[PDB]
Design a protein around this ligand. Structure first.
Ligand code: HEM
Ligand SMILES: CS[C@H](Cc1c[nH]c2ccccc12)C(=O)O
Length: 407
């Protein structure tokens, strides 16, 4: 027996590949917690075991506040990214409760459930734009614009400014410690200027939306200007990137498992179950967001010094054989199917009801209206996107639409 000091390469995070699951399993079988080179040169750990991910997700010794980063990382993150500085996503107790309170009611299940008719119209309006018996990229035609439209209408942001939101979201979702600095600063400043002007307009006649609730909190001193702007940015990013990748990953997985797609066609009621299995197997967030040791700490026997990054692999947690029978089998009937793909504890996804509802309406409507859509390319041509973001998602999903039935 000899002690081993190997550090998981950066690429395990930034450039995983088509099947990174075997690699994660090999690391996980040896230990739940490992040194990882993310960002490059940093003291950082990856957590791969389901149960230890679950503990870490809720462990208050891990801070989400950017001021708890070592100075060289803190200074770089703050100068670049409006995302990391002032929202509930990057807040510990008690700031987390203050930053969460103005928006939490808007995301309750029974409230979100009233968006069903408008979501259905958005989905139908998008499918109406498909070329019948043509070819689409499902991401650009549907998976991106559907949830962007939903969160835009729900905030009371003009749908017309779609491509600005798509670009700002993609750039500002990237890790400011790994991604081009100039790009993120420009995105931060362009987002700031747009929303400064929109808020000033919306203030002069508050409308009864979420943006009006957010403006009210700002005007009452519950949010600073930065916290209003950072909060809007999280809601926009987390609002559409995750749902986009759920529809993209999910459609690819169903086409890769055609008998289970036929099952969903025959019995549409199974679609919520299929959504949960999509989230376990290829969850839109492969990693939980920024966490740093606030103090010297031990997690599952490994000593993590103060200031170390701790990266939680939701992807690895989804395939843990301690939790799931046949973890690498995709089975839409898996039940119950408890997973960590929406996180756990105080930062549990506020969007989960809204994401689950959009998933059900999206897949129900695609399967009903396009009775036989298929891949437009050989499956080996379907590429997973590599970037510094928390995402697990496709570059593109070429689809032959086939016949298109009316809404
Ligand atoms: C399938 C869809 C989605 C997935 C897979 C997903 C995943 C997550 C995950 C893993 C976290 C926890 C991050 C952590 O602990 O570091 C989370 C938090 C959050 N997500 Fe979602 N998300 C979903 C859709 C949404 C939607 C539609 C919204 C709309 C605004 C949303 C807004 C939130 C926000 C605001 C947080 C931070 C909550 C907090 O820190 O207290 N998400 N999401
Ligand atoms: C949907 S995955 C991710 C965006 C995201 C989801 N939840 C978060 C909490 C904090 C910070 C960022 C995120 C992406 O980049 O695709």
């Amino acid at each position: 027996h000899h002690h081993h000091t190997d550090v998981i390469p950066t690429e395990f995070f930034t450039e995983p590949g088509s099947n990174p699951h075997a690699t994660a399993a090999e690391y996980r079988s040896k230990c739940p917690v490992h040194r990882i080179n993310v960002p490059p040169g940093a003291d950082a750990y990856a957590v791969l075991g389901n149960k230890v991910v679950e503990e870490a997700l809720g462990d208050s010794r891990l801070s989400k506040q950017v001021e708890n980063l070592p100075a060289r990382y803190r200074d770089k993150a703050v100068a670049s990214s409006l995302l990391v500085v002032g929202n509930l996503g990057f807040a510990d107790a008690p700031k987390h409760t203050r930053l969460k309170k103005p928006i939490s009611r808007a995301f309750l299940p029974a409230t979100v459930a009233q968006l069903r008719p408008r979501i259905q119209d958005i989905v139908d309006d998008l499918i109406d734009t498909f070329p019948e018996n043509g070819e689409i990229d499902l991401l650009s035609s549907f998976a991106l614009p559907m949830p962007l439209t939903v969160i835009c209408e729900y905030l009371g942001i003009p749908v017309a400014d779609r491509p600005l939101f798509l670009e700002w979201s993609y750039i500002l979702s990237q890790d400011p410690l790994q991604h081009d600095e100039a790009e993120l600063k420009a995105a931060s400043e362009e987002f700031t200027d747009y929303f400064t002007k929109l808020v000033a307009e919306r203030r002069t006649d508050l409308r009864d939306d979420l943006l009006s609730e957010i403006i009210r909190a700002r005007d009452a001193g519950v949010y600073s200007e930065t916290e209003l702007l950072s909060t809007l940015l999280l809601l926009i990013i987390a609002g559409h990137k995750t749902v986009a990748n759920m529809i993209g990953n999910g459609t690819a997985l169903l086409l890769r498992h055609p008998q289970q797609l036929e099952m969903l066609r025959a019995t549409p009621e199974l679609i919520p179950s299929a959504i949960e299995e999509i989230l376990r197997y290829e969850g839109s967030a492969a990693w939980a967001s920024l966490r740093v040791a606030a103090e010297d700490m031990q997690l599952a026997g490994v000593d993590i010094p103060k200031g170390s990054f701790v990266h939680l692999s939701l992807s690895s947690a989804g395939r843990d054989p301690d939790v799931y029978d046949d973890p690498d089998g995709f089975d839409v009937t898996r039940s119950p199917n408890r997973h960590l793909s929406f996180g756990h504890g105080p930062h549990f996804c506020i969007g989960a009801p809204l994401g689950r509802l959009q998933g059900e309406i999206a897949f129900s409507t695609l399967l009903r209206r396009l009775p036989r859509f298929e891949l437009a390319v050989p499956p080996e041509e379907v590429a997973w996107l590599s970037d510094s973001s928390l995402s697990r998602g496709l570059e593109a999903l070429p689809i032959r639409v086939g016949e298109r039935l009316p809404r």
